Every structure is written in C-alpha cells, then in structure tokens.
Ligand SMILES: COc1cc(C(=O)[O-])ccc1O
C-alpha cells in the first residue's frame with residue numbers, strides 16, 4: 001500500500017523538522033516519539049530515508065559519531081523537504097477503511113464459548129489500559145519538556161511558539177487516551193452482556 | 198501478510214452463514230463484516246481462490262441464468278469449519294498504532310490554526326457519519342432484516358439466535374463508542390485552537 005509509505009514519509013519529515021539525524025538515531029527517536037501514533041520499524045525507515053535523499057527531500061552529510069573518530073551520515077531536510085512537509089500537512093486526512101481485529105472477533109463470538117468471549121474482552125481491556133498508561137506517561141514527559149525529541153524541537157523554535165508546539169503533541173496523546181478509555185468501557189459493557197446470555 | 202490471514206478469518210465467518218458465489222461474497226462482505234474488517238476486490242477474490250486451493254472451501258457449479266451458463270458457488274468444507282473455530286480461539290493480535298488523524302494533530306504547528314480547524318471539523322464529520330451508519334446497522338440487526346444475518350439465523354437453532362444477534366450489535370456498539378470518543382477529542386481540539 002503506497003498511501004501508507006507516503007504517510008511514513010510524512011512522519012519522517014515531521015521528526016526531522018526537529019533537527020538532523022543519522023539513520024540509526026532517526027529510527028530510535030522515531031520509535032520513542034512519533035512512532036506511537038504512526039509506527040515504523042528499522043527496515044521500513046532506512047529504505048524510505050534513502051529514497052527521500054535520492055529525491056532530494058533530505059540532504060546527507062558526514063558528522064562525528066561516538067568518540068573514537070568515526071563519522072556517520074546525518075540527514076537534514078532540504079528546502080524541498082520543508083515544502084513537502086508543508087504540502088503534506090495541508091492535504092486532508094485520508095481515512096482508511098476500518099480494520100479492527102477485536103471488533104471482528106467480537107462480531108462472531110458465537111463461534112466459541114462465552115468463556116472464550118470473556119477472555120477476549122479481558123485481553124482487550126488489558127491492552128488499552130497499558131496503552132493509556134503509556135500515553136499518560138508520555139504527556140508527563142511532554143509537559144515537563146524533557147522528552148529528548150521535543151526538547152530539541154523547542155531549542156529550534158522561538159519561545160513564543162512553545163505553548164503551541166507542546167499543546168499539539170499533548171493533543172495527540174489525549175486522543176490515544178480518549179480512544180483507550182472508550183475501548184475499555186466497550187469491553188466492560190461486553191462482559192456484562194455475557195452474563196445475560 | 199498476517200493481514201491476509203485476518204481477511205481469511207473474516208471470509209470464513211461470512212461463509213458460515215451459507216454458500217456464496219465470488220460476487221455475492223464480495224458484495225455481502227462489504228455490507229456486513231467489511232464494516233469492521235474491510236477488504237477490497239483485489240484481496241477478497243484471490244483469498245477465496247487460495248482458500249479453495251487449500252480445501253477450506255468447496256466450489257461447485259450452479260445455474261447462472263437459464264441458458265445453461267454456470268457460476269461457481271463456495272461453501273465451507275469440514276476443514277473450513279475447523280479453521281474458523283481454530284481462528285476464533287486464538288488471541289487477537291493488536292497491531293501498532295497507525296492513525297493518520299493523530300499524526301496530523303501531533304504536528305498541527307506545521308500549518309495554521311485555520312488548517313487545524315479544518316482537519317478537526319473533517320474528523321468530527323467523518324466519525325459523526327460512522328456513528329449514524331453503525332446505528333442504522335444496529336436497527337437492521339435488531340429487526341433481523343439484514344440479509345446476511347437473516348440467512349445466518351435461518352441456518353441456526355432458535356436457541357442460538359439471541360447470542361448471534363447480540364454479538365453483531367456488540368461489534369457496532371464498539372464502532373459507536375470509538376466514534377463518539379473521536380468526536381469528543383476533536384471538539385476539545387477545536388477549543389484548544391481558540392486558546393492559541
Ligand atoms: C508524536 O509524538 C511525539 C513527538 C515529538 C516531537 O516530534 O517533538 C516528541 C515526543 C512525542 O511523543
């Protein structure tokens with residue numbers, strides 16, 4: 001799916017707007033930040049970074065790596081990269097069709113026992129409770145301004161803009177929390193349904 | 198990859214309501230299970246062919262029109278039924294979050310506050326709509342008039358009907374709960390935009 005690749009491209013542009021990174025660092029920072037809302041692995045990120053440089057959306061250059069005298073290629077947005085980010089953001093969100101394996105499972109719980117359905121709904125609750133705690137913990141790092149990608153972004157932004165920049169990162173994680181809480185409530189409603197069947 | 202095995206599970210679930218030709222499978226899928234696990238023609242048709250080749254479905258020729266043409270109808274085999282049961286037993290595999298609206302919101306500072314309002318209003322509209330669609334679906338499930346549900350019920354012992362229907366409704370109640378959460382989130386975002 002090419003639409004998903006283009007979205008990964010947009011997430012990399014967003015991350016790299018906080019400052020240039022090597023390939024390895026980009027993938028580590030990605031997974032610890034934007035990766036919580038659009039996940040990308042090493043094997044997805046490395047080839048896209050290379051295409052983006054080939055397309056001249058990114059500029060590559062050699063900087064010191066470690067302290068033994070090794071250098072590594074760090075990627076920075078070009079002016080074309082900056083334009084592409086702006087254009088990507090302006091475009092409307094394309095909503096992909098619903099693919100929810102848990103709702104799929106629930107729709108046909110009759111294939112198994114009511115005890116099996118309870119186990120599925122408890123595993124749903126477990127999953128979204130742990131997501132909620134991660135999201136709440138991420139908000140705390142964002143509001144403290146200690147998250148390392150956020151801190152780098154802020155050091156490159158005028159102080160006048162910090163409230164805005166932080167507010168939007170928080171907003172994203174409030175959305176993960178709101179959804180998590182709806183999923184838990186839904187599963188709990190399902191558990192009560194199962195006692196009446 | 199694993200997405201194909203999930204679509205396969207969706208197709209076994211749908212075909213447990215009775216045999217279908219490829220076209221009617223795709224059509225009924227899009228009007229039922231496709232609302233919670235979507236499949237396009239480019240995935241459904243070849244998955245059906247793979248499922249027949251692995252003997253989970255039996256294809257047979259049935260009359261197509263009245264001039265002696267035929268078409269292929271697919272029924273679950275015994276191995277298909279077994280596969281459906283074994284699939285359902287396994288834990289749900291939760292994929293990592295890929296949400297294009299959350300990604301957009303995270304970096305709203307890339308555009309103007311006006312651009313952010315447009316995105317959140319489009320988000321509200323989209324989920325207000327999903328909500329109304331799911332509510333319409335629940336009315337026809339509860340009325341037992343949805344044609345796939347009706348066919349499923351004609352083939353099931355009366356004792357199982359309450360359970361069969363409740364679970365379809367549960368799935369749509371999930372769609373409604375998520376949609377309402379998305380709307381509330383976006384409204385909070387709109388209020389936030391006014392403070393900046
Ligand atoms: C979207 O998630 C995040 C983004 C950033 C950032 O790009 O500055 C930092 C921390 C995060 O959790």
Ligand SMILES: COc1cc(C(=O)[O-])ccc1O
Pocket residue numbers: 107210211214228229230231232233334343345346347349365368
């Ligand atoms: C999971 O969604 C549905 C499934 C069925 C069914 O297989 O009987 C009918 C209507 C639906 O909306």
